[PDB]
Amino acid sequence: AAYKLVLIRHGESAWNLENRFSGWYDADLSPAGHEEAKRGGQALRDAGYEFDICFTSVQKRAIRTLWTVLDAIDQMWLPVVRTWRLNERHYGGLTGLNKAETAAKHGEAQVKIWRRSYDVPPPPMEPDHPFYSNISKDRRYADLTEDQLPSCESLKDTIARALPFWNEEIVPQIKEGKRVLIAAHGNSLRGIVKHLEGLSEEAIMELNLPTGIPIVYELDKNLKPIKPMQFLGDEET
Amino acid sequence: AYKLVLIRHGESAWNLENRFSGWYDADLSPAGHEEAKRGGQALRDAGYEFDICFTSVQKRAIRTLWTVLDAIDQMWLPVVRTWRLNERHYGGLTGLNKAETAAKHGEAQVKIWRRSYDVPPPPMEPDHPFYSNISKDRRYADLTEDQLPSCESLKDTIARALPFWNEEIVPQIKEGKRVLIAAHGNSLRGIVKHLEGLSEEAIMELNLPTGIPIVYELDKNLKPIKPMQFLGD
Numbered sequence: 001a002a003y004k005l006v007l008i009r010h011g012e013s014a015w016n017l018e019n020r021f022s023g024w025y026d027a028d029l030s031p032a033g034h035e036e037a038k039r040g041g042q043a044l045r046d047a048g049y050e051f052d053i054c055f056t057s058v059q060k061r062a063i064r065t066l067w068t069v070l071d072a073i074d075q076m077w078l079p080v081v082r083t084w085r086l087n088e089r090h091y092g093g094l095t096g097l098n099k100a101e102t103a104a105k106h107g108e109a110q111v112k113i114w115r116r117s118y119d120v121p122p123p124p125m126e127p128d129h130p131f132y133s134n135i136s137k138d139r140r141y142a143d144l145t146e147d148q149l150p151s152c153e154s155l156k157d158t159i160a161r162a163l164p165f166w167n168e169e170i171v172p173q174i175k176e177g178k179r180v181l182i183a184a185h186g187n188s189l190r191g192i193v194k195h196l197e198g199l200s201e202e203a204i205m206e207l208n209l210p211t212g213i214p215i216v217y218e219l220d221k222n223l224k225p226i227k228p229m230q231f232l233g234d235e236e237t
Numbered sequence: 238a239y240k241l242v243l244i245r246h247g248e249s250a251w252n253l254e255n256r257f258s259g260w261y262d263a264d265l266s267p268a269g270h271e272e273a274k275r276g277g278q279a280l281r282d283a284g285y286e287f288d289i290c291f292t293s294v295q296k297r298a299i300r301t302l303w304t305v306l307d308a309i310d311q312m313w314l315p316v317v318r319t320w321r322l323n324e325r326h327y328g329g330l331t332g333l334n335k336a337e338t339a340a341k342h343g344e345a346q347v348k349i350w351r352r353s354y355d356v357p358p359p360p361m362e363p364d365h366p367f368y369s370n371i372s373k374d375r376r377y378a379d380l381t382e383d384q385l386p387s388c389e390s391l392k393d394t395i396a397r398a399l400p401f402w403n404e405e406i407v408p409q410i411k412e413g414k415r416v417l418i419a420a421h422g423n424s425l426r427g428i429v430k431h432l433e434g435l436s437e438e439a440i441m442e443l444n445l446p447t448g449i450p451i452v453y454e455l456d457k458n459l460k461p462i463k464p465m466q467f468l469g470d
């Protein structure tokens with residue numbers, strides 16, 4: 001096809017192991033999640049992939065995934081662009097809580113409701129929240145307006161703030177002929193995939209992208225996929 | 238009262254920093270990487286914050302930067318890479334050790350090269366083991382014919398580094414952005430010579446330490462207000 005686009009979702013974080021809600025909390029990769037990034041990188045290397053520009057979030061689990069991939073394909077010299085708009089979904093007041101704490105405080109019914117909803121956000125991260133200053137006062141978000149910096153996000157919100165970056169910064173690069181690599185998170189990449197494929201809310205909520213696996217799109221000049229997304233790796237993976 | 242930080246990368250693999258590594262894309266050795274970690278460590282201990290980073294397109298410099306951002310927990314910073322901050326291109330000498338260089342060219346000519354600001358080594362010819370590896374590398378594909386060197390005098394190196402300094406780095410500093418530059422001995426020589434107004438002789442005698450944060454305090458004219466300070470224990 002005219003264009004080729006590659007996505008990669010970061011693997012396991014240190015908080016995944018604690019089964020806590022990370023969201024915008026900047027958890028690093030676990031050793032195993034770092035190895036996942038190494039395997040992805042290796043798959044891209046074995047297939048001879050070349051990029052011209054890379055996009056990632058401002059969260060280190062994604063950024064470190066990118067670094068690991070560039071290292072494996074010997075393209076550390078590529079231009080890299082970071083943006084909060086590709087950050088994981090903001091889980092608001094749930095941030096820092098584990099599974100038990102969440103069901104204990106809110107009940108199974110309510111957590112099931114948050115889980116299955118496209119457009120209901122979790123509770124806001126208020127100023128007395130233990131990670132409030134850690135996230136909302138981090139200088140990396142200093143250029144954000146009041147309306148841009150979320151206290152919490154529905155999946156709809158996450159996608160809504162990811163897609164402007166896609167349209168305004170990545171899309172022109174692709175049409176300029178640049179080969180793009182995006183290293184980001186489950187839900188921001190869900191935003192990109194929902195847009196590319198014209199998926200429904202129902203469909204996108206049932207889509208779980210695998211972690212650490214290069215995801216390959218073949219796009220026409222209008223950035224319409226010409227075939228289903230392909231996963232890159234050995235046969236078992 | 239601007240604050241500027243420079244860092245020169247440490248040891249590269251296979252003793253290449255003692256073999257005119259130049260534009261060959263040598264990685265850090267484990268030890269050069271540990272030097273970078275110590276630098277990062279010192280910057281963290283002093284509570285340094287940056288807003289933007291500049292580096293070359295050579296992986297030993299880039300990995301040095303990565304190691305530093307990792308240690309100071311600022312992996313989210315914007316990073317700009319440029320060939321103009323590359324190491325000096327040592328032409329046909331690239332990859333050769335001291336003995337091989339003297340064997341091939343004689344002590345007289347090597348002494349003349351060591352001491353010249355403006356005499357380049359011989360060009361890297363098609364029979365050099367790194368010729369296609371470097372000249373056909375995709376990262377330089379947009380460089381014009383005159384821009385991609387076959388060899389460089391120190392003068393050449395500085396001449397192509399300073400335009401990036403003036404056009405890209407200077408406006409950031411004047412905006413108050415706190416800049417970190419992770420690069421190479423001779424490109425950082427270019428910057429230091431411009432800042433301090435050094436003579437050719439002085440800049441040729443200046444050997445910046447590796448893996449150590451080098452700190453500048455600049456006035457409203459980007460003129461240093463005191464000598465460079467080294468950061469560490």
Ligand SMILES: Cc1ccc(S(=O)(=O)Nc2cc3c(c(O)c2O)C(=O)c2ccccc2C3=O)cc1
Pocket residue numbers: 019020021097098099111114115116122
């Ligand atoms: C931190 C954490 C706790 C519990 C789980 S789970 O075993 O129940 N699997 C799981 C859970 C959720 C979710 C999920 O996809 C899932 O696989 C959600 O998407 C979700 C969205 C909004 C609020 C809560 C959830 C949610 O709890 C996963 C992660």
Ligand SMILES: [Cl-]
Pocket residue numbers: 080316
């Ligand atoms: Cl980077």
